[PDB]
A paper describes a structure:
To verify the direct binding between the two proteins, we prepared the recombinant HD-PTP Bro1 domain containing residues 1–361 (referred to as HD-PTP(1–361)) and the STAM2 core region containing residues 260–370 (referred to as STAM2(260–370)). We note that both the interaction of the STAM2 peptide and the insertion of the N33A and Y34A mutations do not induce a dramatic conformational change of the HD-PTP Bro1 domain, as our HD-PTP(1–361) and HD-PTP(1–361;NAYA) structures overlap each other greatly when superposed with a RMSD value of 0.61 Å over 355 aligned residues. Nevertheless, together with a slight conformational change of α1-α2 loop, a remarkable difference in the arrangement of the HD-PTP molecules was shown in the two crystal forms, which allows STAM2(350–370) to be accommodated in HD-PTP(1–361;NAYA) and the complex structure to be determined.
HD-PTP is a non-receptor type protein tyrosine phosphatase (PTP) that contains five domains (Bro1, V, central proline-rich, PTP and second proline-rich domain). Considerable evidence has also indicated that HD-PTP and Myopic, the homologue of HD-PTP in Drosophila melanogaster, are involved in the morphogenesis of MVBs and in the endosomal sorting of cargo proteins, including integrin, Wntless and Wingless, and EGFR, and that the Bro1 domain is necessary for these processes.
Numbering used by the authors: 1 to 360
Amino acid sequence: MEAVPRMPMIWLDLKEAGDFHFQPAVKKFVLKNYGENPEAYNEELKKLELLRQNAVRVPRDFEGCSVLRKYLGQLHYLQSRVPMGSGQEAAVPVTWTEIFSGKSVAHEDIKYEQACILYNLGALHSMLGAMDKRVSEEGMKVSCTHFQCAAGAFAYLREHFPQAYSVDMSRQILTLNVNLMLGQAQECLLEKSMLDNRKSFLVARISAQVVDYYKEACRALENPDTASLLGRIQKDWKKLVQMKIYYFAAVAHLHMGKQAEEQQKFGERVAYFQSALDKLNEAIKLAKGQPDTVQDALRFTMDVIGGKYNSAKKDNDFIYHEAVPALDTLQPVKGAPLVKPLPVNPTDPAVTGPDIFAKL
């Protein structure tokens, strides 16, 4: 299982930005309230504008993440000095395209701009994580960190922006995103633990956790309101995710099988391999029409499980003659969480650089 072909990963698209004309409001505030010249601060507003234009047309690569967090940070620094929140004096319309329906959604609130940049940070992390092939030592560790970063960004949005500015950032949908990301992160670690050939029982528990994350995500997908918004996207995700639910349940029981054979419980060895074979077969049925990357993972895994089941059932029928216990009676595999939504510090000076609006 060290060498199993990698499953493909889900990633989210970035939102499309409308206009955020903050400079006339900033200047009209600093003349009216401090009593200064408008044009006294035109380099620190112009730098912000070049920073925003760069963020909303962000390069789809690792450097692009730092670009988004600098702008996220600079946006906070501005709000700390100029009141551009909902209902406040210098508030200007912020417009963004809601990613699933394509509708323009506008809010006279700077936190809306912050929220969308945060979303795109999460989406971009999901992209970087999913394009890697996860074969090298360096792809597996970084993909996992990217997916945790994605989860962390969406989780931060869920907590600090409870007002759903638009339905693509509603709480149940951000929850879906978080669980999807943690699932893919956990999946990366499972692949790593199988490469490192960790204790069979530990691998089983890790795989069981992959199942728990994907199940939560799958639950969210069977929600009518979520299903209607996502549209086709719901059907693509669900078909991959539902398939993976049975696949990693099979991987989990494969390793419960290997543990059983390590402990000389050779009747239970057969039970776990049989169970793994049935669950894998359901996965294969659910995987019809899916790309060859999926099919190659499943057929590699079937030769592993198929071979061990045959070996296990046979030495048991001729040598050990122990009864094959019903799964019911055997202790359930509990998931082992190894991943967490990595917290975002928007105003970390190491990522924001000097405050553009230091003078103010």
